[PDB]
Amino acid sequence: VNSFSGYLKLTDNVYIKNADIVEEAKKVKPTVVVNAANVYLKHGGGVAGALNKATNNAMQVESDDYIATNGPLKVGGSCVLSGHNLAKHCLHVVGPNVNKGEDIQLLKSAYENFNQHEVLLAPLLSAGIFGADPIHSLRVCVDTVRTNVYLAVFDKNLYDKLVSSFL
Ligand SMILES: NC(=O)c1c[nH]c2ncnc(N[C@H]3CCCC=C3Br)c12
């Protein structure tokens, strides 16, 4: 039993809700919140800009030190950093950005990072400003993640479409 509330169950291990991941993280304080990161951990917009803003820029400060030490992530890769006031940990995951020409096949590799964590609150990777089809992202999520994932979809209109079209 966990504290996630109001989710629709899609499969044995995947759940979905129309919610703002920032407000959801603040309420649940999950062990792991997933950020829709880029390789530079520059949290400017989309989910990343919103999560970083909610940390009063502490996420960005921590991220800049991480990059200065380790260099950029790989597309499809991840790192675990602090969750600040939102969660115990933040799993920064880099899905391919279609608006940069990155290979959509890397979306499966990106979701594989979720399997290192028993339970996660997450957005749909590569959706929104990353330019991929969210219906496809949900399909890859369901077919790749085996741990318990609670997906937050900001747009109410998009949420209804993902549910109604789910196989
Ligand atoms: N500024 C923002 O993009 C968000 C702030 N919180 C969010 N929670 C969920 N998805 C978000 N964005 C996108 C990316 C994922 C696919 C649908 C949507 Br909608 C955001």
- Looking at residue 92, which CATH number applies to its domain? 3.40.220.10
Mutate which of 17, 93, 153 for ligand 1? The one with the most ligand atoms within 8 Å of its CB, which is 153
106 within a domain of the structure (yes/no): yes
State the DSSP H helix or E strand holding residue 125, giving kind and residue range, or none if neither: none
Q: Is residue 2 part of a domain?
A: no
d(CA 35, CA 125): 9
162 CB near ligand 1 (under 6 Å) = no
In a domain, 3, yes or no: no
Number of domains in the chain: 1
For 25, the token pair is 């993280």
Q: List, in sequence order, every residue forming a beta bridge with 35; answer none if it has no partner.
A: 92
Any atom of ligand 1 within 6 Å of the Cβ of 93: no
47 CA → ligand 1 middle, Å: 5
In a domain? residue 110: yes
Assigned domain for 29 exists: yes
Which method was used? X-ray
SS3 of 47-104: the string is: HHHHHHHHCCCHHHHHHHHHHHHHCCCCCCCEEEEECCCCCCEEEEECCCCHHHCCCC
* Residue having the nearest C-alpha atom to atom 1 of ligand 1: 46
To one decimal, the resolution in angstroms is: 1.0
152 C-beta closer than 6 A to ligand 1? yes
Q: Which domain holds residue 106?
A: 8-163
* Rounded Cα–Cα distance for residues 64 and 81 (Å): 11
Q: Is residue 88 part of a domain?
A: yes
Question: How far apart are the CA of 20 and the centre of ligand 1, in A?
Answer: 7
Query: Ligand 1 centroid vs 158 CA: distance in angstroms?
Result: 10
Cβ–Cβ under 8 Å, residues 147 and 119:
yes
Record the tokens describing residue 68, joined without a space.
Answer: 């200065």
Is the Cβ atom of 47 under 6 angstroms away from ligand 1?
Answer: yes
Domain annotation covers residue 21? yes
Kindly state whether residue 121 falls inside one of the protein's structural domains. Answer: yes
**149 CB under 6 A from ligand 1?**
no
**Cα dist from 109 to 50, 74, 104, 116, 152, whole Å:** 24, 10, 10, 12, 20
